[model samples]
Target: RIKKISIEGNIAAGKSTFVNILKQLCEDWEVVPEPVARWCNVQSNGGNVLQMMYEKPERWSFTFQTYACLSRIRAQLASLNGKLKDAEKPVLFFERSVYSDRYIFASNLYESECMNETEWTIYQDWHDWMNNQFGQSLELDGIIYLQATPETCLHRIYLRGRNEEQGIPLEYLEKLHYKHESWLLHRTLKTNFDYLQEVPILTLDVNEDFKDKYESLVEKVKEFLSTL
Candidate 1:
């Protein structure tokens, strides 16, 4: 079924390179790319101004939360269905997990005053629903976490030249790194598995080998998967 292994990090975190390497090295394996197409589609179909309007938290929180939940659920289901493989699957590597959006984006946005009372209440209800789904848990094989400094993230984003992502301010990315670090710490401490649950949480540091990081990353993945 869903033996999904994720390759995730902050925006511009080299996830795409890792996915490419995985595709090349493990030719038979399937790699699911991030659904940035939705972001683009929304933008193309008159969602850009709306998105910008909601840039102030109070005006945008509910809409953003709703969009993320729907998108993540779609990604989750795509993983669950035999879209991965019917049997004897060679690991499915996802460029990013849907859950990361909530942890990385929504948490940062929660402080914004973009919502009116009604919108705020609806968002709270959605948050509670999502927390319940995660609290109940689901099946996951592993996670490959690629970490880099905020500087590295910004550099990558600039290099990529995706206009839609240009709106993500630098300050927000900086705050998100700290929030993600805290979330990881808590998960490591509280998870109940004897051998580590909530995926293996394999970490890759982009700063250490900036010039040739992708090759090194592939090697790390090879080693980890080979051991498994």
Candidate 2:
């Protein structure tokens, strides 16, 4: 058996960066990355869904969110049951999980009114059933939340300079930051995710780059994993 953890945070809050440093300390451990490649489908020509969803969120959020949930759940299951079964990695960290997709991104979009009531209804309906179907596999041991301010996240996004995210505004990151906080740290948002209550949450301030304090950061993560 292998332990599963998730690195949860707002966009550009240094999730992938943290994971890279983590594996250095926790050798042979592997991470199941967020399935952006699958979402983009660039291998065989990226799909139109993401583009249309971005350019016209009001019209396309429902469909795009549905696909994200499906792809995320698939990635979550495949990592533990497929590759990790052959050789148990001490810890398998998911870059993000289906829970974040629901509580953070999807809920934020709906709350922002990018999705209509009818669309929200269907989205929740499908998500509930799928959540039930995979309820067992969805268990998480812990979550590492990089609790960065929107300012920090926005700065990173600008530095990374992903062309697809050129139009991303600071207000949007602020919304997502609160969503991440409510779900992981504050427990202010009410949902069917009470199981999260039992899991450990480690909120690290991402105001400074992790590399600046690499030694201490590694010790923190190493000790956290020790408890799990």
Candidate 3:
């Protein structure tokens, strides 16, 4: 039986909103949010690592992505373990997972030269070791992928108005969009690394309005969960 699933997509792809919607529809399952706050407020003098990365990619790309990799590993393991003992619910949902982080976001940074060769090498080594060590246990039944155009994502990001994301360029969004699509849809991309155990993918197009389709989306998710 399926016990958990992770929602993944490009930045401002409505992952959090969609996850929250699922939480409301499926009362029995626990929703594991992205550790955004933890990332933003970690250590004594903390700030938004995402914002830092965007504001100065050359300076903070390696640092922020490394921190993100560690934080995601912790979150994935902790959530999976917690759900293991919670037989009553038998289901858990996450905003995103280490798979997307490494394959899409961090990989993009490395490929874009935001993270230099040495830094990228170190990051990949860490990821490879971590995957071999704990990858088997973090398996999921499936992943819910929300798909959107780079333009759509940019518009949504602007609407949300996060100060850190203010300077995010459309070009970056376009690159991320393609990376995500390649990761989810194409298996032949050379950098298409799969850390998560193989599972079905439920891809949903969110380029249009979701409010009118909310109930149907809920039903679709429920149906998918039922099969698992």
Candidate 4:
């Protein structure tokens, strides 16, 4: 059972940088990178298959969320089987964990459509399954939230210069980013989280200079980790 520390936020929320800073500030730490690049690689020709069921909003949303949950479960299980941990951890740091994906994907689907009663029932069942998956795996000790605006996420995404993300229209990414933020905030509240929730939350407004923000973040992690 690793003492997991997760860094989660909008896609371009400087999560990787925050992870690096936390590592430098703490001794005996492990950082796990988010698997988006791998997922994107898997979805090399990916599209929302749900678009085909546009007429059946409820069913399409269910299918959409189901695919996401399955992908998340598979990815997480694979990661735990050693795809994620590059080495053993005295204190494990996660760039983005599977739970984050589960919540975010659910948020995305909900954002895309209104759920009918039946659809919501199906969703609740899926939620239960997801919860079981999480309970069976490692529990978290900390979750550091790195925040940035949609504009910032896009800027970073552009800066990264990944060919896979090149054709992504800003409009869609912006919409998804908004959903990511809204859903994250809500999930953080509605969920019963002793680990991810109780841990110190670091919200760095990009308006702050990077040096100042980064220093503050390092300080936050140092203080948070000292407790454990």
- Kindly indicate the candidate among 3 and 4 with the higher TM-score: 3
lDDT of 2 by residue, 54-134 (tens): 788998889889997898888778877755565645688899888888878888889989999999998888898998989
State which candidate has the highest TM-score: 2
* RMSD in angstroms between candidate 2 and the native structure over all alpha carbons: 1.8
User: Lowest-lDDT window of 10 residues in candidate 4?
Assistant: 48-57
Ranking by TM-score: 2, 3, 1, 4
lDDT of prediction 1: 0.63
List per-prediction Cα lDDT, in the order shown.
Answer: 0.63, 0.81, 0.79, 0.60
* TM-score, every prediction: 0.77, 0.92, 0.89, 0.65
Candidate 3 per-residue C-alpha lDDT over 28-72 given as tens digits, one digit per residue, 9 for 90 to 100:
676778877777767737677778888789889999988887887
- Name the regions of candidate 2 deviating beyond 4 angstroms: 86-89
Better of 1 and 3 by lDDT: 3
| The best candidate in terms of lDDT | 2
Q: Give the TM-score comparing model 1 with the true structure, all chains together.
A: 0.77
Once fitted onto the true fold, the runs of candidate 3 whose alpha carbons sit more than 4 angstroms away are 190-197
Candidate 4 lDDT over 129-194, as tens digits, reads: 766756656566766666676677778778777654555556656766665565455543444344
TM-score of 4: 0.65
